[PDB]
Design a protein around this ligand. Structure first.
Ligand SMILES: O/N=C/c1nc(CCCCCN2CCOCC2)ccc1O
Ligand SMILES: O/N=C/c1nc(CCCCCN2CCOCC2)ccc1O
Ligand SMILES: CC(=O)N[C@@H]1[C@@H](O)[C@H](O)[C@@H](CO)O[C@H]1O
Ligand SMILES: CC(=O)N[C@@H]1[C@@H](O)[C@H](O)[C@@H](CO)O[C@H]1O
Ligand SMILES: *[C@@H]1O[C@H](CO)[C@@H](O)[C@H](O)[C@H]1NC(C)=O
Ligand SMILES: *[C@@H]1O[C@H](CO)[C@@H](O)[C@H](O)[C@H]1NC(C)=O
Ligand SMILES: *[C@@H]1O[C@H](CO)[C@@H](O)[C@H](O)[C@H]1NC(C)=O
Ligand SMILES: *[C@@H]1O[C@H](CO)[C@@H](O)[C@H](O)[C@H]1NC(C)=O
Lengths: 532, 532
């Protein structure tokens, strides 16, 4: 049967799902690890013991335990990102969409969800792999991984809570795809990993980690890169936050053993209730438990790895959105509101700068403020709002990504860079937020092909274009069809630094994406902070 | 007789000079001090002993001893600024142009020449007062003062070489005008002092100095202000340079008495031969012997005087030119040449930055470089050339002046601000130098009214406009004619910060002159340097 697949771990039974007036096979909730529950909380994942019988893979699995966004109850803009399945520590599963009839050996794409390493679900409507698998005839995988303290609590030196175990969750799913996707018609030698935000940083982290490089062919990173200021902490900061967490829960803090045992006795929501209290600064775009620079998953610092070429050399496709910052200002900066234009007073602007660069001294705040203030019109509330927007996105997403892309292209085998700046016509968020963090995903997964979702015909064309860029890149290492008459997406090179816009207008090619601000964020400001 | 005038110091006999197919009276080379020669070198000026008989005031006096520009022999662009009279330490004289017939009690304007406190002459063709005196019916005075070491060698604590004596030369000329201009038909209660560059800084310094405030009514500063980074040094730096000077001349350095006596034995050219060797940095737009913050002429620091309102409160007219920096880059920065377009390589740009901010550390140089580099086009040699031009003018002229004008307007009684950006049609300097430091003077003194000098009719109109703005301001404290139908020059206020362009086009009003760069030069960079 087409819905029955024999794997090295056992048989699985999928389900036939409709898609665009056709059908494909879906294998939902396949386990790839032992449930990381009980005494295994905070530990590295173990591989799933093979099973007898037929595993029912007809339904979506549980989502991992996470903080849940209640800032706008009933509002689809925020709740479409919340878990849409019961939460459970028993959450290490993956999902596969397979073209029908079953392919023999086809291109594989593995989706890694974002969410600041504190949240995320493989089961969201916007991650439904059936449109991409059907349209582009790829085998689409989405994995899952522990977030929050459950995935990233780091007590370096301990083997019970070493840190990075959510990254190892991802790697074990990658190992499982490598070992088993051939049975689903996937080609294990042509696996592209792709992800957005924390998932894009994750993709970059598997590019860097020697233990991960061999498990995939090429990589796509959307609005995230491994060197992002929020994506990792040192071993000392990870230890400090773990101890502060136990301090929030009245834990014996005498030893790692005491602390871990206390934290393992707590119910999941107890950890989530206090998770945000361990941040060291009054900040935005900073998350409590994230990957740790441990000398094991990451052999040395990220910057020295990037400088020495210590990373997998292959092709990469990556990009950013126009207004990456607006989401985080909405949720955490004074003066921003969902239902107003959020014109920003000068006081509020200064408050925003401080939340945005929480590690900066007062001279650093001044440097940032000078760089982003039109002093001919300092009380322009729209310029203050857009200026804060740019600060948050430049510092947290665009300029770290530009630093990564420039270090990587020196040693890599091909780079394609995009600037996604289409505001969707059916967007439920306010105008001022612009082209929001995460809102290219629905185009990458082909949601505008579904008529009931109220996109324009031009947006369907843009989605089909992006889906084909991405799958063609996954298949060949080049998003362009050979001998095609459509406009070509030029390679990004050290010399020319070309990129394209992604929108409903005819493709335009630019160079040196936001280079003025990224020189400030990547060269000048770190020098200023290190000297003062 | 109209050419004979009885003053408190004695009688003087002027000469009738032609001007624009008419005639006026000129009284040239009137002494206002004792010759500061011999044992008086470096000392405060003494007042001139009154004389018997009639002083022959028919000819221009000697110019003070100064370094002479030989960088372009025979080239009128540079030599029109050189002394055009024999040099002598016997040089403390002033010149008066008087309308004919002699007025009874008219507006007086006193010109103070520029030249970095190391050079300058009252006798230059471009300072000929006859056009302004004739056209606007003012009594035009030009004074002189010691420059170089002769005017500004500073051994604080010594009464033989206290410093600032060139400023006291200026003040004694002002005292003489106050005491005697009534006899020439001048009104001593309506004296405007005006000057360019070091002379504009000089004007600002008499505004600040309590010993000078009472000797004039109002003030005009052109491309110079008292707080300029080159216009003054501390008492310790003045002492260091004085000692280094004696070290260059094999002087006994055991005591101030030893040092001063040695320096007084030297011929003037011996001092001039080594004057440039005492600068502490590899710099441009820095001069060896300048005013010193002595606690006497200047009671406290300039910044605290400006903050507390400790200065004469009156009306001021001031402005800058578009390309103040190009002169100094031509003479001292690598890659700039009189006869090429001076397109500037990146290496040369970096060299220029270091010469321009010689007191900056490497982080400060980076801040400057970032502020003035278009990183989308970093190898644009024209952008590097114009960028260096702007750095030099912003840092040395425009932004210090903007700092002065903003501090002053808080306490003053009326400010008028101009941006002079007309390139003269007969300019002999290359195109790349633009609207050069000092090249508004010829318009202020009415040279375009002389047909043989090859200006356009529009330039004659601009000169007449500027002459009338200036004389009307000198007469009333407002450059605008009351109940006039011509376009009005708005007051500069703390709130609106309006200024005008001065060129051959219809007047345009702008606000916040070069405010973006001046926030960098006046707020951020000093903070950066003081913290690092
Ligand atoms: O990948 N997306 C993650 C993402 N994260 C945010 C930050 C929301 C964090 C809210 C934290 N608060 C802190 C105080 O306690 C309650 C929760 C905002 C937009 C985003 O897209
Ligand atoms: O007020 N004008 C003064 C002014 N000053 C300069 C600087 C020229 C200084 C040349 C100094 N050098 C230094 C080395 O020895 C020879 C002389 C350039 C343009 C100007 O307008
Ligand atoms: C998928 C979607 O957005 N459907 C909308 C629906 O929610 C709305 O009630 C209706 C009225 O305008 O328009 C359509
Ligand atoms: C005052 C002035 O500039 N006069 C010039 C003269 O020097 C030049 O030789 C002549 C030829 O063009 O034109 C006129
Ligand atoms: C698999 O699970 C679904 C939902 O729980 C159920 O409808 C279906 O019959 C199951 N298939 C089996 C048990 O073979
Ligand atoms: C990738 O590597 C191959 C050799 O393995 C080389 O021929 C090709 O030019 C490389 N492409 C890029 C874009 O570096
Ligand atoms: C004044 O000096 C000039 C030039 O030296 C001379 O021509 C003139 O006759 C003199 N007048 C006198 C001495 O009365
Ligand atoms: C100048 O001072 C007078 C009072 O002496 C005042 O009435 C006038 O408004 C002032 N002008 C300005 C521009 O401050």
């Amino acid at each position: 049967s087409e819905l029955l697949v024999n794997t090295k771990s056992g048989k699985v039974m999928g389900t036939r799902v409709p898609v665009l007036s056709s059908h494909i096979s879906a294998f939902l909730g396949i386990p790839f690890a032992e449930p990381p529950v009980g005494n295994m909380r905070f530990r590295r994942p173990e591989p799933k013991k093979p099973w007898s019988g037929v595993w029912n893979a007809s339904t979506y699995p549980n989502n991992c335990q996470q903080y849940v966004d209640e800032q706008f109850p009933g509002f689809s803009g925020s709740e479409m990102w919340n878990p849409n399945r019961e939460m459970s520590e028993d959450c290490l599963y993956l999902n596969i969409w397979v073209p029908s009839p079953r392919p023999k050996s086809t291109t594989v794409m593995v989706w890694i969800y974002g969410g600041g390493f504190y949240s995320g679900s493989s089961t969201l409507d916007v991650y439904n792999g059936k449109y991409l698998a059907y349209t582009e005839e790829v085998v689409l995988v989405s994995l899952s991984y522990r977030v929050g303290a459950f995935g990233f609590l780091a007590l370096h030196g301990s083997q019970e809570a070493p840190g990075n175990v959510g990254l190892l969750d991802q790697r074990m799913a990658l190992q499982w795809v490598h070992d088993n996707i051939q049975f689903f018609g996937g080609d294990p030698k042509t696996v592209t990993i792709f992800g957005e935000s924390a998932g894009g940083a994750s993709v970059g982290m598997h590019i860097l980690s020697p233990g991960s490089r061999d498990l995939f062919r090429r990589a796509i990173l959307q609005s995230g890169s491994p060197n992002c200021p929020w994506a990792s902490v040192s071993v000392a900061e990870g230890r400090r936050r773990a101890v502060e967490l136990g301090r929030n829960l009245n834990c014996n803090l005498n030893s790692d053993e005491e602390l871990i045992h206390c934290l393992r006795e707590k119910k999941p929501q107890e950890l989530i209730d206090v998770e945000w209290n361990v941040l060291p600064f009054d900040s935005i775009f900073r998350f409590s438990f994230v990957p740790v620079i441990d000398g094991e998953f990451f052999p040395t610092s990220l910057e020295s790895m990037l400088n020495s070429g210590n990373f997998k050399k292959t092709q990469i496709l990556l990009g950013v959105n126009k207004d990456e910052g607006s989401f985080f200002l909405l949720y955490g900066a004074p003066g921003f509101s969902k239902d107003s234009e959020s014109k920003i007073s000068r006081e509020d602007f200064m408050s925003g700068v401080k939340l945005s660069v929480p590690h900066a001294n007062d001279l650093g705040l001044d440097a940032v403020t000078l760089q982003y203030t039109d002093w001919m019109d300092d009380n322009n509330g729209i310029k203050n709002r857009d200026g804060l927007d740019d600060i948050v996105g430049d510092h947290n997403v665009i300029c770290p990504l530009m630093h990564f892309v420039n270090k990587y292209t020196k040693f890599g085998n091909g780079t394609y860079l995009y600037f996604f700046n289409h505001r969707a016509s059916n967007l439920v968020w306010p105008e001022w937020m612009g082209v929001i963090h995460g809102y290219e995903i629905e185009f990458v997964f082909g949601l505008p092909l579904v008529k009931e979702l109220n996109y324009t015909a031009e947006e369907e064309a843009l989605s089909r274009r992006i889906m084909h860029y991405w799958a063609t890149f996954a298949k060949t290492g080049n998003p362009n069809e050979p001998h095609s008459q459509e406009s070509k997406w030029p390679l990004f090179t050290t010399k020319e630094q070309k990129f394209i816009d992604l929108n409903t207008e005819p493709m335009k090619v630019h160079q040196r994406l936001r280079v003025q601000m990224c020189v400030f964020w990547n060269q000048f400001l770190p020098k200023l902070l290190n000297a003062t």
